[PDB]
Ligand binder design. Sequence first.
Ligand code: 53C
Ligand code: CL
Length: 115
Amino acid sequence: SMSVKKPKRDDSKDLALCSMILTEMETHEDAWPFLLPVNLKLVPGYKKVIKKPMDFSTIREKLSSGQYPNLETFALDVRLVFDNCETFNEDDSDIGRAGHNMRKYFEKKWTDTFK
Ligand SMILES: CC(=O)c1cccc(O)c1
Ligand SMILES: [Cl-]
């Protein structure tokens, strides 16, 4: 509360660490459904069903331009990619399996890096 400070977690390397994690996700062989925004004009259902589209290239643009106030907002966008994927794809489709794999990959990197 006012003039009562909780001890300061060092956040100075967060930007660099999120960038490295994102690089590792960008180069994973199962990243291909997530590299670019889903084409809303070529993919039936997507625009109406998925209220907040997100993809790796959009996360990268946002990270590169100061649009994440903190490491948790970055993680929320990453998770949104995989949450959207589950909403729109069957668990046992190539894209559906790619999403589950990439989520598992991300969360281990997240835990190992920050937690
Ligand atoms: C990421 C996703 O859910 C997707 C990507 C390309 C085509 C498609 O039908 C769905
Ligand atoms: Cl499917």
